[PDB]
């Protein structure tokens, strides 16, 4: 997972600081992780995580 | 004449480094998130500060 800046303050090559908002982009899939809004039927109140823009 | 000149210190030689922020420096504030420069201009007879869209 490439760890990439989400803020314009940080830039490529900068050390990651605790508490920073970052984006995890899979090397192969190429689409950042995303917490879907589709509620899971098996467990109520639980969402899903999938790779998409 | 009898005029006397008093030496008032504003900045020392050690603090005159070009790699640090110093009093009196002319710099502009750039908003990284919005990618806009801080600016102030007269709009309706009163000077107002804002970020200018480019």
Curated annotation (Swiss-Prot), chain A:
Annotated compartments: Endoplasmic reticulum membrane; Cytoplasmic vesicle, Secretory vesicle membrane
Post-translation changes: Phosphorylated by AKT1 on serine and/or threonine residues.
Tissues where this protein is expressed: Expressed in intestinal crypt and villus epithelial cells.
Domain MIR stretches: 13-53
Signal peptide start and end residues: none
Coiled coil region boundaries: none
Domain description: Composed of a large N-terminal cytoplasmic domain (CD) followed by a juxtamembrane domain (JD) and a transmembrane domain (TMD).
Role noted for this protein: Inositol 1,4,5-trisphosphate-gated calcium channel that, upon 1D-myo-inositol 1,4,5-trisphosphate binding, transports calcium from the endoplasmic reticulum lumen to cytoplasm, thus releasing the intracellular calcium and therefore participates in cellular calcium ion homeostasis.
Family classification: Belongs to the InsP3 receptor family.
Associated disease: Charcot-Marie-Tooth disease, demyelinating, type 1J: An autosomal dominant demyelinating form of Charcot-Marie-Tooth disease, a disorder of the peripheral nervous system, characterized by progressive weakness and atrophy, initially of the peroneal muscles and later of the distal muscles of the arms. Charcot-Marie-Tooth disease is classified in two main groups on the basis of electrophysiologic properties and histopathology: primary peripheral demyelinating neuropathies (designated CMT1 when they are dominantly inherited) and primary peripheral axonal neuropathies (CMT2).
Oligomeric form and interacting partners: Homotetramer. Homodimer. Interacts with TRPC1, TRPC3 and TRPC4. Interacts with TRPV4. Interacts with SIGMAR1. Interacts with PML and AKT1. Interacts with IRAG2 (via coiled-coil domain). Interacts with CABP1. Interacts with TMBIM4/LFG4. Interacts with CEMIP. Interacts with TESPA1. Interacts with TMEM203. Interacts with BOK; regulates ITPR3 expression. Interacts with BCL2L10. Interacts with CHGA and CHGB.
Name of this chain's protein: Inositol 1,4,5-trisphosphate-gated calcium channel ITPR3
Organism: Homo sapiens (Human)
Span covered, complete protein: 162 to 214 of 2671
From Swiss-Prot, chain B:
Tissues expressing this chain: Expressed in intestinal crypt and villus epithelial cells.
Binding site for 1D-myo-inositol 1,4,5-trisphosphate: 52, 54
Subcellular location per the Swiss-Prot or TrEMBL entry: Endoplasmic reticulum membrane; Cytoplasmic vesicle, Secretory vesicle membrane
Post-translational modifications reported in the UniProt record: Phosphorylated by AKT1 on serine and/or threonine residues.
Coiled-coil annotated spans: none
Domain MIR per the UniProt entry, residue ranges: 18-54
Disease as annotated in the protein's UniProt record: Charcot-Marie-Tooth disease, demyelinating, type 1J: An autosomal dominant demyelinating form of Charcot-Marie-Tooth disease, a disorder of the peripheral nervous system, characterized by progressive weakness and atrophy, initially of the peroneal muscles and later of the distal muscles of the arms. Charcot-Marie-Tooth disease is classified in two main groups on the basis of electrophysiologic properties and histopathology: primary peripheral demyelinating neuropathies (designated CMT1 when they are dominantly inherited) and primary peripheral axonal neuropathies (CMT2).
Subunit field text: Homotetramer. Homodimer. Interacts with TRPC1, TRPC3 and TRPC4. Interacts with TRPV4. Interacts with SIGMAR1. Interacts with PML and AKT1. Interacts with IRAG2 (via coiled-coil domain). Interacts with CABP1. Interacts with TMBIM4/LFG4. Interacts with CEMIP. Interacts with TESPA1. Interacts with TMEM203. Interacts with BOK; regulates ITPR3 expression. Interacts with BCL2L10. Interacts with CHGA and CHGB.
Function: Inositol 1,4,5-trisphosphate-gated calcium channel that, upon 1D-myo-inositol 1,4,5-trisphosphate binding, transports calcium from the endoplasmic reticulum lumen to cytoplasm, thus releasing the intracellular calcium and therefore participates in cellular calcium ion homeostasis.
Protein family: Belongs to the InsP3 receptor family.
Domain remark from Swiss-Prot or TrEMBL: Composed of a large N-terminal cytoplasmic domain (CD) followed by a juxtamembrane domain (JD) and a transmembrane domain (TMD).
Protein name: Inositol 1,4,5-trisphosphate-gated calcium channel ITPR3
Native organism: Homo sapiens
